[PDB]
Amino acid sequence: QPSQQKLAEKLTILNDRGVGMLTRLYNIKKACGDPKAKPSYLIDKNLESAVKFIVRKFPAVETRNNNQQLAQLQKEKSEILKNLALYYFTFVDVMEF
């Protein structure tokens, strides 16, 4: 039913949403590019092993048998979930768009 499609509204809203997503991703990239504004967790030394291991196998998550490799991350998860929420939520919004 062409009347119920509302293609005009869909297009005019998705264009603005895409512009906003582009702006947000550009800001995130600029923040994470220079080695001064990116989160300290990505430059911190003792936390380097955890990030490297996670990057080694990104699609799969295995926290059950970590072999004392994510111990450092296990005592600061509250800060990770308080500092990195914005970027993950932006990625989720991009996926929804």
């Binding site: 009347s3 119920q4 509204e9 869909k10 005019t12 919004d93």
Partner: protein, 49 residues
């Protein structure tokens, strides 16, 4: 009196180089919202659902 016949007021005023606004624009918190497709229903001859 006889020389004042050829005189007009120069327009001269002094301001402050940069003038700030009465109230400064404040930051606005970002609130995540879902993609809503029913926001233009009140613009023109809109359709509902």
């Amino acid at each position: 009196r006889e020389i004042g016949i050829l005189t007009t007021n120069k327009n001269t005023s002094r301001t402050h180089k940069i003038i700030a606004p009465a109230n400064l624009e404040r930051p606005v918190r970002y609130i995540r919202k879902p993609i809503d497709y029913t926001i233009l229903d009140d613009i023109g001859h809109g359709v509902k659902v």
